Amino acid sequence: SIDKQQIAASVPQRGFFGHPKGLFTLFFTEFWERFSYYGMRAILVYYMYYEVSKGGLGLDEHLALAIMSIYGALVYMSGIIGGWLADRVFGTSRAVFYGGLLIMAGHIALAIPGGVAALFVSMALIVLGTGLLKPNVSSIVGDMYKPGDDRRDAGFSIFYMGINLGAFLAPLVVGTAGMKYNFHLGFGLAAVGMFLGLVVFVATRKKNLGLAGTYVPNPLTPAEKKKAAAIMAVGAVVIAVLLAILIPNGWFTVETFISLVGILGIIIPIIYFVVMYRSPKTTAEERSRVIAYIPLFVASAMFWAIQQQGSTILANYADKRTQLDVAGIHLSPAWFQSLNPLFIIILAPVFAWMWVKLGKRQPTIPQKFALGLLFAGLSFIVILVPGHLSGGGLVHPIWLVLSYFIVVLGELCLSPVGLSATTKLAPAAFSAQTMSLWFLSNAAAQAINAQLVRFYTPENETAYFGTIGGAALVLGLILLAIAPRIGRLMKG
């Protein structure tokens, strides 16, 4: 580990609107990575189930939606693996570079002509790449600011703005090109986008970032290196023999893989909670807090289940259930993916002002978890209405827009206090696993979403939206009732 002051001494402190010029490097690196990921994601589901004559892969709609959900789950889990790799072996800067290369390679696999096999390879590359780049790029920006610098909070705020900006612009650019012209063109623009991010990072990181991220904070001992390497070596071999027998006659299929991730989505959080609660490095007070964190984890998972279905289920809804031909123009179904980031950009300052204005009268963190859950459930109730009232046929796009608007209201309640809630209720011995634990509920939600896809049909569409939305409302009411007890248990 290199001293923070010596790190800051290597980084230029000016050059980018009162901020270090390294922020420029990191803002645009992450922007383009998010742009590419969100652009590709906006059209990926359509590319999967559209007929082959339309340039699609011709897969079943349910299979496509399930794969999308597994995709997001694996990406979230990959950030945990990748965060460990930078911290213990690569360094954050080197992780961003290698990750970025893998991401770019993944987009290329989609850009070039190919079938379902090309998609699976692309998925693996992006999952691995995003895991290395996404969590580690945000680690470097902190390195640029010396302790006591009041520009730090402002720097992160600007950096995070690029994530939303990439999320807003991508479906309008990559989505339009992919849907209107050709799918591979859109995937190609995503590849170009990531390439732009790679260029800016590689070319400018030496001067702009200096020593930041070029070191290994927690390197393995020599004995650990041999211990680690053998496990993956044995691990890699063991997986290979299994799949070789399983692929033709097992039979390990994409459905089995989807089921596995669904199994992992339930098992993994359980193991995490058991380990924390049974840990000999925990106090009695901390063990009670872990228990108190359980309903908060469940609420998060329920909320993110609905929210992340906006990129899957509602994506299919925009394409199959929504009147695109309005006002003499044809709306692109991928454009609806721009709704969530747009509403976030506009409403987030309003919510912040509201919390400030409320002051002591503002809801507590567990109550904000409940509010988020109530809004999420409401968004599904609203969404079923038009299809329910109409005998059949497409519905007005205003219903879907409203549904996205409502879930954002819930997101701005739960999400900003999500990590904060996790830190306050996690034992000091597990203080390092705080981000992973918070990410885990979002990952588990998406893994579960994939199992729920089969229930989403035109026949029981009302039942699907109603049961899920109803479940969120019920849990929301329960959480409100136990919120006072949980709030008092929080550290502070």
Residue the block writes with tokens 């509201």: 354
Instruction: Calculate Rg over the CA atoms of the chain.
Output: 23
**β-sheet bridge partners, residue 475:** none
* Cis check: omega of the bond before 438, within 30 degrees of 0: no
Method: X-ray
Domains of the chain in sequence order: 1-492 (1.20.1250.20)
> Distance (Å, rounded) from C-alpha 91 to C-alpha 85?
7
Q: What is the resolution of this structure in A?
A: 2.1
Running DSSP on this structure, what letter comes out for residue 16?
E
Structure tokens at 164: 């939303």
> Distance (Å, rounded) from C-alpha 255 to C-alpha 384?
28
How far is the CA of 483 from the CAs of 236, 287, 439, 487, in angstroms?
A: 45, 18, 22, 6
Q: Could you tell me which of 67, 139, 135 has the C-alpha nearest to residue 99?
A: 135
> Distance (Å, rounded) from C-alpha 275 to C-alpha 433?
12
How many C-beta atoms lie closer than 10 Å to residue 360's C-beta? Answer: 4
Helix (H, G, I), strand (E, B) or coil at 330: strand
End-to-end, the C-alpha distance of the chain in Å comes to 30
C-beta of residue 100 within 8 angstroms of C-beta of residue 194: yes
Residues 233-244 as b or e (16 or more Cβ within 10 Å = b): eeeeeeeeeeee
Structure tokens at 191: 């590849």
Exposure on the CB side of residue 273, measured as CA atoms within 13 A: 20
> Distance (Å, rounded) from C-alpha 88 to C-alpha 91?
7
C-beta of residue 181 within 8 angstroms of C-beta of residue 80: no
How far is the CA of 368 from the CAs of 157, 358, 390, 415, in angstroms?
A: 21, 13, 35, 9
C-alpha 52 chain-centroid distance:
30
> Distance (Å, rounded) from C-alpha 76 to C-alpha 88?
19
Structure tokens at 71: 């995709």
> Distance (Å, rounded) from C-alpha 359 to C-alpha 201?
41
Residues recorded for the chain: 492
The phi and psi torsions of 217 (rounded to 5 degrees) equal -60, -45
> Distance (Å, rounded) from C-alpha 322 to C-alpha 303?
24
Q: Which residues contact 184 (CB under 8 A, 6 or more apart)?
A: 55, 110, 111, 112, 113
Written as one letter, the residue type at 186 is: G
C-beta of residue 430 within 8 angstroms of C-beta of residue 279: yes
Residues 300-332 as b or e (16 or more Cβ within 10 Å = b): bbbbbbbbbbbbbbbbbbbbebbeeeeeeeeeb
Residue the block writes with tokens 């999500």: 418
C-beta of residue 450 within 8 angstroms of C-beta of residue 312: no
Q: Which residues contact 375 (CB under 8 A, 6 or more apart)?
A: 406, 407, 409, 410, 413
> Distance (Å, rounded) from C-alpha 387 to C-alpha 303?
23
Q: DSSP characters for 266-332?
A: HHHHHHHHHHHHH-TT--HHHHHHHHHHHHHHHHHHHHHHHHHTTTTHHHHHHHHTB--EETTEE--
Running DSSP on this structure, what letter comes out for residue 395?
B
Written as one letter, the residue type at 468 is: I
> Distance (Å, rounded) from C-alpha 85 to C-alpha 90?
6
How many C-beta atoms lie closer than 10 Å to residue 259's C-beta? Answer: 15
Running DSSP on this structure, what letter comes out for residue 1?
-
C-beta of residue 136 within 8 angstroms of C-beta of residue 92: yes
Running DSSP on this structure, what letter comes out for residue 322?
B
> Distance (Å, rounded) from C-alpha 372 to C-alpha 39?
27
Query: Is beta strand 325-326 parallel, antiparallel or unpaired with respect to 19-20?
Result: unpaired
Residue the block writes with tokens 């193991």: 271
> Distance (Å, rounded) from C-alpha 380 to C-alpha 7?
49
> Distance (Å, rounded) from C-alpha 445 to C-alpha 411?
15
How far is the CA of 420 from the CAs of 209, 344, 346, 417, 426, in angstroms?
A: 29, 19, 23, 5, 10
Structure tokens at 244: 């070789």
CB-based burial of residue 478 (10 Å sphere; 0-12 exposed, 13-18 middle, 19+ buried)? middle
Written as one letter, the residue type at 374 is: L
C-beta of residue 343 within 8 angstroms of C-beta of residue 180: no
Query: Is beta strand 329-330 parallel, antiparallel or unpaired with respect to 19-20?
Result: unpaired
The phi and psi torsions of 281 (rounded to 5 degrees) equal -95, 15
CB-based burial of residue 163 (10 Å sphere; 0-12 exposed, 13-18 middle, 19+ buried)? buried
CA angle 169, 42, 121 (to 5 degrees): 120
Structure tokens at 209: 């970032």
> Distance (Å, rounded) from C-alpha 43 to C-alpha 38?
9
> Distance (Å, rounded) from C-alpha 87 to C-alpha 435?
14
* Cis check: omega of the bond before 251, within 30 degrees of 0: yes
> Distance (Å, rounded) from C-alpha 351 to C-alpha 340?
15
Query: Is beta strand 19-20 parallel, antiparallel or unpaired with respect to 15-16?
Result: antiparallel
